[PDB]
Amino acid sequence: MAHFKEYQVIGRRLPTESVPEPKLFRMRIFASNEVIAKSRYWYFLQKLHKVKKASGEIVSINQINEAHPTKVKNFGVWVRYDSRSGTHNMYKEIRDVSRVAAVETLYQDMAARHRARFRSIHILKVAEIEKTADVKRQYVKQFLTKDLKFPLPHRVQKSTKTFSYKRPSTFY
């Protein structure tokens, strides 16, 4: 489900005769589609308040597009996840051009490094790092140096045919 979009989901408890106009709670949810986004909304509202989908209503769901989707950003993400033997809190840094793409990278990386499935991940917070010297992971820091430039040694060229006649090279 990593064709990720971000939605704002606003919902509430159902109005009653004694309590009209409830407090209109809102969440930011990364999900593949609106159905999953509303599911995640009710999942988190059930887990933090005494409101289930039966006693409430979704007032609004809107897709939030990245404000500047074409500038490279440094993102700090806070997650809590479940391992095989406990729950843990984690902080990670992702360099990428949008929030949804950072979160996609986050899910792929948590699956790769911790075998943490989507079920097992709560994204606590995704925030742009305003400036350098606040980045704390070296794998992001090393890309922020001055006049960065590196080669890509050992280029492997795709061959459309079964046999080549030339014993190819890896120069680049």
Binding site: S159, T162, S164, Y165, K166, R167, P168, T170
Partner: peptide
């Protein structure tokens, strides 16, 4: 003689 690039170790 030809080569098979999908089976070449260097690639």
């Amino acid at each position: 003689r030809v080569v098979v690039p999908q089976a070449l170790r260097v690639l």
